[PDB]
Symmetry: D2
Subunit: 127 residues, 4 copies
């Protein structure tokens, strides 16, 4: 599908939710990293959540090879805008990708000033 | 052993945390019922959490027999008393207790106005 | 839209997820109740989760009046099929509806043998 | 007061629960780092949880100065050792500690192979 970047099949979607207001968390920054050979974190994709609190088309399946990826969520800047003070600096989700072939990754995240949970729903797409 | 009622070997404790403030949820009313033989819920025990967000002494080893129980946590009153309007009326935890001998049950509850999780920790008595 | 039942605008959707396998919880029973005048629970809508773990079209906006609704999730039968033993009998979500006009209700639920969280994302639909 | 290192007034405790078995997660390795002045993570403290799923004595009041800290919890090794293959490599909790005087921090973590939540409980010292 899309070359280099884009979403050739949409292999990764990040969905953020606000548990204090019961609404989707809009305009949250999401930075995604891939571990490099030197073993440090190399910038991979990034964006802000839409009106539905989702972020997709961060990457493409040709570009999304097996490796170790890190999803960072600027949760702190998010609360600061609502006048609340958070405890965390941000949230990270570190996972190895496509241990045995690609599939979709939906990284979910539920946020509160002092807590956040994160879940992954890995699904084998079809036609 | 502790007769009548009380907290014999502490077979049942409830613990509530506030995810918005990062503290124990205090003064949360908790009502516990046991499933009667006529499929109705009979009031079993009740209480309010301490400064620590804990509640022990709801029942006793002798009294805590096999059955189906429901811990109802009054999360609404709690949030309302803070100036927030939660989504849920309350949070229930229904389970079969002691089907294979007396166990000790720690019902943990983490609260957000629009979301809540409950985890159960079951342990074997030893002294 | 649809008369009586159906989904005139799709005011309530239940989404269930499996946190042990990282997959949507398929074929889970969901029974929804409305408190009646006598104050007991009157059967309102029901169904089983689709392949995506979602359930919608349970009700219609003309039928979904303000009231107290209860979403019961047969989580126990769900684990029993996977060979695991759960702690809970089921999960309930009790909430008052449309305090000030309708909007969509997505009741979410994340399940584990011994824990489950539930969140509501209430959104004002548009055109 | 407790010099060198230890657990002065217990300014930092980590607690891990297993959502699959309903017990405390035991033998979970935990590494704690402090953000160095050169933006790097310096190893601050480390440990493994007890039968109770707890870890105290990681640091001390004197040593636990203002700064940015990251509690890394090795959730992978834990699940792998059970015959499961988790989704995350580990779980991190990054936060600014003691920006307004010494507080006591209870980092709580609830684990599922495909999901995890972390709640923070901050309290004021009193004796």
């Amino acid at each position: 599908g899309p070359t280099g970047t884009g979403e050739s099949k949409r292999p990764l979607m990040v969905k953020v939710l606000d548990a204090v207001r019961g609404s989707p968390a809009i305009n949250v920054a999401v930075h995604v990293f891939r571990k490099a050979a030197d073993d440090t974190w190399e910038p991979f994709a990034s964006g802000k959540t839409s009106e539905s609190g989702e972020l997709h088309g961060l990457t493409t399946e040709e570009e999304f090879v097996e490796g170790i990826y890190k999803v960072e969520i600027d949760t702190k800047s998010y609360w600061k805008a609502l006048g609340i003070s958070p405890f965390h600096e941000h949230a990270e989700v570190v996972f190895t990708a496509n241990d045995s072939g690609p599939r979709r990754y939906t990284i979910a995240a539920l946020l509160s000033p002092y807590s956040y949970s994160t879940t992954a729903v890995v699904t084998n797409p079809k036609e």
